[PDB]
Write a protein that binds this ligand. Structure first.
Ligand SMILES: [Cu+2]
Ligand SMILES: [Cu+2]
Ligand SMILES: [Cu+2]
Ligand SMILES: [Cu+2]
Lengths: 658, 658
C-alpha cells in the first residue's frame, strides 16, 4: 500500500525535520505537530520544501498516547539497549507504536514523535513495531547502515562526502572508499580481526538479533520459542567463529575476563563520530580497570560487587541443578529447558524467573566495560561502543566478556548426560563420505579473498545536497562451493533425515590435533537441512548459498530477514592453507521434528514461526561431553556421521563485487 | 591595496576549495592550480560558482617554491606547535610566505598552496607571515574563532548550526546558544573555572601570543627582545590570574605536578571535535599515567627519563649560576639577562644556547601530557587538548604543568639580591593615594557579572549554506572604572615616572592577611604607562579600558594583549577583598636607549617594536625576595608606592551587551 510505503519515509534522513522532503514525497504536518522551534515560523517553513515534491501526504491530527517517557531521553544523547533506564524507555515506545489502532494512526503518531524523540531510539522502536505488527509484515525496512552510517564508518569520510556532494554535480560524483583496518596499527596484534569485528554484516547481524528477540517490551514481541537458548547459542557461535579467525591470524583462543578487578589489556578506540549526539564515541585505554558505577541521569548505581554477587548466585543455581523463582518454588534445570531458563537468567530478559536474585549480569557487564572512563558522570561523557548493541562487537573485550559468560553456560552443559551410542545412531543410515568442490579449485578446498561492495548512504546524510552517495566497503568473501554427501539407506523404505554440517580447526594453537573436549566448542554450524533418503544409495548435492545459517548477500548489501551474513560463512584461513575438520551427521527427522502440523523445515524465522523446528539442543551434537571412551572426533562418530579434511586457502587479492 | 584584502579572503571557509565563492568575490584560478581531483572537472566547476559574485580576482600563474615539506602534513590530520616535526614544517611554510617579492606573488603562492596544505597549518603559517612582512603591516586579520569554530565550541552545536542554516532561510534564523560549563559536573570542583579556562578570549590570547613570539621559524620572526623573559612572565601572570579566580571559587592555589611519575589526579574531557581532522581531542581519565612516547609519524621517541634529565640539567645550571654553550663557554645567569636565557632554554626556542643539553622541556611535557591514552600510536589517536596551543589552556593540568615550570624560574629569581630601599624610592616623588571609581558604585569597589556576546561563525562553517550564523557566548565581564592617583612631586623640575599597577588577594585560602613571601607571587599586573609629573601635586585619572595589559573588547568579539572582559577577577557576591598596589618608578633609570616611532605611547607590539620599553625586569618590583626586615606589603612600600583596600563584587546576572 501507499500507507505502508509512507512509513518507510520515516527512515529517510533521521535528523531532517519531517516537513522536509522525503524522496518524492512530503508530509503535510498539522500545525500542532511542529516542534517548538519551528511552529512559530511554521507556515513560512513548510511551504519552502512543500513545492518540491511529486506526492503530498496528509496527516490527520489525532489524540496521541503519553510520550513523556519516550521523550525523556535527549535528542543528542546516545541510545543503549544495555542501560536499564533506556530499555524501559524503549519498551514504552514499542508499546505505543504496537497499540495504534491501525496503520493510519501509526503514521500519525510516528510523524508527531519523530522530531521529538532520540533518532536511534525512534529507529529501534519503530523497527521493532513494524516487524511484529500484523498490518506491516512485508515492508522491506532499510538497513540501519544506510540510515545511520555514523555507527559503521570511519568519521573521516563524512566531510569527504559533504565536499563531494557540495562541489561536484550529481552525474560526476565518485564513490567514497571506506577505510578498513583503521582503528589501530601493527603494534596491536588485535587489529588483525578488523575483517570480523568491524564487518558491516557481522555488526548488522547483532542488531537484527536484538530487533527480533528484545529483552523488554510487550509480551507479544518478547516471548519467542526457546529465546533463552538462542541467546546462548548465538553468542556461542560468535565465539567459535571468532576463535576460528584468531587461528588464521597467528593468535590464541580468546581469553575470558578472569576477574573483573584485574586490568583489561586490550584497549580499543573506535574512530566513530555520532552525528546524532554530535559527539565522538569514547575509547578505552590499554589496561583499564572496571570502576563502580554512579550515574544519576542513567539511573545506574552498581558496585562491581553487585555484579560479582550475581555471578556467584548463578553458578550456585547451575551447581544446585535448579533456580528459585520469586514465589520460592524450584525450577529444575533439566536437559530440555535448562539452557533456556538459564539464557533468560543471564541476559536477564523479563522471562527471568527471578531478576531480583539473579540480576542483569550480561547487560550490566556491557555498561561497566563501556564507562571505565567516566563512572560517576563527573566528566559528562557518554558510553563507549560496548554500551551499544550496534557497535559492541567492534571492541575486542566483547569477545572476552562473552567468552566468560559462555563458561557459565558450559558449566551447565557439562552436567548433562553424554549422548549415548543409541541416541546418536540412525539405524541403516550410513554416511560413507562428504567432500566440497569449488569451481576450478582442488577437491576439499575452500577459498577466501577480499571484495569491494557499495552501499548507498544518501538516506543517512542529513543536511547534505540530494544525490546518491555510494560508499565502497572492503570485506572478506568466499568463492562459491557445494557439498557432495554419499549416504546408503539399506532399510527397504524411505528415511527422512536432518543433515547437520559443522566445521572446526583441525589443530590447536600449537599444531597438534584437537581433542573432542575442546574441539566440540570450536565447531561452527555451516548448514542444517532436511532430506528424503531413498532405499539404496543417495548422492546429495548442497550449494553453499542454500545454507540455512546464512542470509543472502543482498540482505546486507542492496523483508526476508536476517541470519549470518553470507560473505562471512567461511573463516579466512591462511595463504599457505589452514587445515579444518568438516563434519556431517544425518539424524532421524522423526525424532527431531516438531509437531508443527499444517492443515525448508530447517530455516527458522523468529518473527514468522511459532516454534523453532528442531527438538534437539541448538548445537547438536556437540553441546555435551563425549560418552566414555571417546577422546576425539575420529572416534566420536557413528556410521551416520562422517569426517573430511578440508584446506582453507586465502588469497590476499581484491575483486570488484563481480 | 586590493591585494591585501584578497589575502583575507583565504581565511574564509578554510576547507571549502578556493574556487568556490569567498566573500562577495571569486578567484580565477589557472587550470594547473587546481588540485588533482578537480583539474579534470575544472570546466564544470568554473561555471558552477562565482557568477553570483561581484568582484572576480585574476591570479597570475607563477613559478613556486618546493612545497613538499608543508604538504607532508596531511589535510585531515591534526596540527600542534609543541610537536618538533610540526614546528619545523610551519617554519618552512612561514619561510616561503615571507620569501615572496611582491604582495601579488604572495597571493599566487597562497592561492596555490591553500587547497593542498593542512588548513590549521595554513592559517597559522600565513597569519605569522602577514604579521611580519613589511608590505602587509597593520592588517586586521580575522579571528581564529570565526574561521575554526571547531577549536572553540562544544561539538554538539555544529549540527545545531548546520540544521538552522539548512532549514531556516537567512532572514529568519535565530542565534545558537554556546553551552557554558559543559565539560564537567559539580562532582568535579575544577568545573567552577569554566569562565576562565574555557573562555574564548583567554584561549585566543594564548594563540595570538604564539603567533607573535613563535619559537621556531626565520630568525627575523623569532628573535624579539627579551622573548625568553616574556615567556616566563606571560606564563607567570596566567598562573597569577588563575590563582585569583581559584580564590574566588572556594578553591586553593593551584598545586604543581609533583613530578612525572605520580598519576595526574585531574582528568579532563573537552567535548571538542576537529572538523579538519574528523577526530577528537581525546579526554584524559582521572589518575592517568605519563608514559614514554614512541610516536613514529610525529618523530617523537622520548622517555620520561629524557625529560627528567633535562629538568635536572636546568636545575643544575640555575644553582651554578650559569649555562654552558655548545662550544663549552659559560654564559652567566645574571640580574639582567639570566631570566631571558633561562626562558629560551626552558621553552626551548631556537635561541636556547644548548638544546642538546637542556632539551625542549616545556614543549615536550605538553606533548607527554597530551598522549597518555596512546603513547606509541598503536590506537592511531591524536593528542589531547594539551598538545595544542589553541586549546591547551582548557585543561586543569595546564596550570599544574606551568606551576611546575614556574618553580624552576622562581629558583633563579630567589638567587638575585633583594631590591634595596635605594633601588625602590624615587627621591622627591611620593604617592599619597590611589582609589578606584566605578559608575553607580561606592569608591574602592570593582563589579563583575555575566554577559552574552554574538559572533558570526559563517566564515567557518564549511559546506553549510551561506548567510549569517550567530553564536551567543556567555562570559565574565566587569563594570568600567578609573583609577585616581595622587602624586606629590617636590622637585622644582618635571619628573617622568612609570606607573605600575598590580592587584592581589588580601588574604590566603584561610582568610588570613597574606605575607609578602606569598603575596608577591599573587600580584596581577593591571596597567603600566608613563606619566609626566609637574612640580607639586598631580592628579592622574586612568580608565580601565586604557590598560596596557589589555586589548579592546572589539578585537575578541565582533598588538598582543589580555582580553578586556577578563581584566578583573570574578570576586564574590558577598565581596572579595584585594590589595591594590601602585608604584611610581624613576623613568630616567627605566628608560631604554633605543628611540623609535611623545614617550607616553606605551602600546607595545613585539613585531612592531625592536626593543622592550622598560629596562626593569618584567614583574618589577615583586619579582625578587624582600630586602631584610620586610615581611608584608605594608613594610615593603616606599613613599613612591601606595596601597588601597578594594572590594571585588560578583553579581550572578546576565546583561545583553549595551
Ligand atoms: Cu547480543
Ligand atoms: Cu553482550
Ligand atoms: Cu604558551
Ligand atoms: Cu606550555
Amino acid at each position: 500500500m501507499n500507507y505502508k510505503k509512507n512509513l518507510l519515509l520515516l527512515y529517510d534522513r533521521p535528523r531532517e525535520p519531517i516537513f522536509m522532503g522525503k524522496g518524492k514525497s512530503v508530509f503535510d504536518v498539522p500545525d500542532n505537530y511542529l516542534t517548538d522551534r519551528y511552529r512559530p515560523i511554521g507556515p513560512e517553513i513548510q511551504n519552502r520544501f512543500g513545492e518540491l515534491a511529486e506526492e503530498r501526504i496528509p496527516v490527520r491530527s489525532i489524540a496521541l498516547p503519553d510520550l513523556r517517557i519516550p521523550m525523556s531521553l535527549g535528542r543528542q544523547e546516545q541510545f543503549s539497549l544495555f542501560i536499564p533506564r533506556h530499555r524501559k524507555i524503549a519498551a514504552r515506545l514499542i508499546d505505543i507504536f504496537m497499540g495504534m489502532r491501525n496503520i493510519e494512526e501509526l503514521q500519525s503518531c510516528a510523524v508527531f514523535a519523530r522530531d521529538r524523540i532520540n533518532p536511534y531510539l525512534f529507529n529501534y522502536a519503530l523497527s521493532v513495531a513494524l516487524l511484529h505488527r500484523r498490518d506491516t509484515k512485508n515492508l522491506d525496512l532499510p538497513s540501519v547502515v544506510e540510515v545511520f552510517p555514523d555507527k559503521y564508518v570511519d568519521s573521516r569520510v563524512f566531510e569527504q562526502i559533504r565536499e563531494e556532494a557540495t562541489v561536484v554535480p550529481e552525474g560526476m560524483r565518485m564513490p567514497i572508499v571506506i577505510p578498513k583496518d583503521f582503528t589501530a596499527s601493527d603494534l596491536d596484534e588485535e587489529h588483525r580481526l578488523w575483517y570480523f569485528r568491524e564487518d558491516i554484516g557481522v555488526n548488522l547481524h547483532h542488531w537484527h538479533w536484538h530487533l527480533v528477540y528484545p529483552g523488554d517490551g510487550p509480551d507479544s514481541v518478547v516471548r519467542k520459542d526457546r529465546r533463552g537458548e538462542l541467546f546462548y547459542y548465538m553468542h556461542s557461535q560468535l565465539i567459535a567463529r571468532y576463535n576460528f579467525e584468531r587461528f588464521c591470524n597467528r593468535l590464541q583462543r580468546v581469553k575470558r575476563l578472569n576477574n573483573l578487578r584485574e586490568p583489561i589489556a586490550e584497549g580499543y578506540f573506535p574512530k566513530l563520530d555520532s552525528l546524532v549526539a554530535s559527539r565522538t564515541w569514547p575509547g578505552r585505554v590499554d589496561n583499564a580497570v572496571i570502576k563502580d558505577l554512579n550515574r544519576e541521569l542513567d539511573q545506574i548505581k552498581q558496585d562491581v560487587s553487585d555484579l560479582e554477587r550475581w555471578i556467584d548466585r548463578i553458578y550456585e543455581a547451575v551447581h544446585q541443578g535448579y533456580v528459585v523463582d520469586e514465589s520460592g518454588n524450584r525450577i529444575f534445570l533439566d536437559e530440555e529447558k535448562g539452557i533456556d531458563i538459564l539464557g533468560n537468567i543471564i541476559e536477564s530478559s523479563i522471562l527471568s524467573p527471578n531478576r531480583q536474585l539473579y540480576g542483569d549480569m550480561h547487560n550490566v557487564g556491557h555498561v561497566f566495560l563501556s564507562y571505565t572512563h567516566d563512572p560517576d558522570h563527573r566528566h559528562l561523557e557518554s558510553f563507549g561502543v560496548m554500551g551499544d548493541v550496534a557497535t559492541a562487537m567492534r571492541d575486542p573485550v566483547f569477545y572476552r566478556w562473552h567468552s566468560f559468560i559462555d563458561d557459565i553456560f558450559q558449566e551447565h552443559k557439562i552436567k548433562l548426560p553424554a549422548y549415548t551410542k543409541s541416541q546418536l545412531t540412525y539405524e541403516g543410515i550410513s554416511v560413507t563420505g562428504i567432500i566440497v568442490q569449488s569451481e576450478g579449485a582442488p577437491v576439499n578446498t575452500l577459498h577466501t579473498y577480499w571484495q569491494q561492495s557499495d552501499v548507498d548512504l544518501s538516506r543517512g546524510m542529513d543536511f547534505v545536497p540530494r544525490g546518491n552517495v555510494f560508499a565502497r566497503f572492503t570485506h572478506l568473501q568466499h568463492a562459491p562451493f557445494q557439498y557432495v554427501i554419499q549416504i546408503d539407506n539399506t532399510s527397504d523404505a524411505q528415511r527422512m533425515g536432518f543433515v547437520r554440517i559443522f566445521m572446526a580447526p583441525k589443530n590447536d594453537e600449537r599444531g597438534q590435533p584437537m581433542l573432542f573436549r575442546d574441539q566440540r566448542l570450536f565447531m561452527v554450524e555451516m548448514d542444517k537441512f532436511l532430506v528424503a533418503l531413498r532405499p539404496g544409495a543417495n548422492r546429495i548435492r548442497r550449494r553453499s548459498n542454500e545454507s540455512t545459517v546464512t542470509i543472502p548477500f543482498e540482505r546486507t548489501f542492496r523483508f526476508c530477514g536476517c541470519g549470518w551474513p553470507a560473505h562471512m560463512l567461511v573463516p579466512k584461513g591462511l595463504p599457505e592453507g589452514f587445515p579444518a575438520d568438516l563434519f556431517v551427521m544425518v539424524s532421524n527427522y522423526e525424532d527431531d521434528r516438531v509437531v508443527q502440523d499444517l492443515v525448508d523445515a530447517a530455516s527458522y524465522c523468529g518473527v514468522r514461526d511459532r516454534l523453532y523446528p528442531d527438538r534437539k539442543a541448538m548445537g547438536f551434537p556437540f553441546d555435551r561431553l563425549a560418552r566414555t571412551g571417546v577422546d576425539r572426533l575420529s572416534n566420536f562418530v557413528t556410521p551416520n556421521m562422517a569426517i573430511q579434511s578440508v584446506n582453507v586457502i586465502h588469497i590476499d587479492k581484491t575483486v570488484p563485487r563481480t
